């Protein structure tokens with residue numbers, strides 16, 4: 001679809017079999033989801049944002065559906081202010097910025 | 100133009116008579132630019148995301164050019180690790196997400 005930016009680019013996602021809401025974020029390298037129970041092996045990771053760094057659990061090769069589109073990649077689970085879908089997965093669903 | 104997401108969507112902008120490189124961030128409500136001595140009245144403000152909040156100076160009616168596209172709106176100036184173009188300006192250059 002074509003999504004304008006007058007409102008936050010929020011979309012429904014399916015992860016771990018659970019429906020969640022996430023922000024399509026072109027300014028995020030990675031995908032960061034709020035703390036949740038996710039089937040998979042993970043390893044400690046640290047990421048940065050506008051005000052500093054936070055610790056997250058890095059889960060590799062996670063199957064996830066974003067607005068009806070499938071992607072299989074790295075998902076970071078931690079205390080993020082908001083669920084964000086980063087470029088790592090947006091590239092998988094063929095998302096581009098256009099103006 | 101079309102901007103893929105294989106790498107950070109960085110564009111050249113012009114603000115305060117200076118040229119800078121900024122990240123098109125669909126996950127940012129506002130525009131945060133690195134510390135610069137902009138002329139005029141401003142309002143104290145705090146903005147946050149991953150890592151926490153940072154103190155910024157809110158400047159209104161700032162004329163800015165993004166990737167050759169004119170825009171005018173609110174610009175927050177402060178200790179940001181990266182120049183961020185948020186939705187408030189991206190909407191003005193008619194930028195959309197497509198997949």
Ligand SMILES: CCCC[C@@H](CN[C@@H](CCCC)C(=O)N[C@@H](CCC(N)=O)C(=O)N[C@@H](CCCNC(N)=[NH2+])C(N)=O)NC(=O)[C@@H](NC(=O)[C@@H](NC(C)=O)[C@@H](C)O)[C@@H](C)CC
Nearest residue numbers: 027028029030047048049050081126127128129147148181
């Ligand atoms: C979590 C909040 C929603 C998404 C977020 C993403 N912002 C980008 C901007 C900074 C880019 C460096 C970001 O943090 N991206 C991270 C996301 C985490 C991630 N791992 O992908 C990133 O790419 N981090 C890279 C590092 C960037 C490298 N660049 C550099 N160091 N200069 C990483 N860790 O690999 N938005 C924001 O940070 C904006 N906040 C918001 O839009 C809202 N604030 C809140 C708290 O929700 C609004 C109510 O103000 C900021 C800029 C204020 C307007």
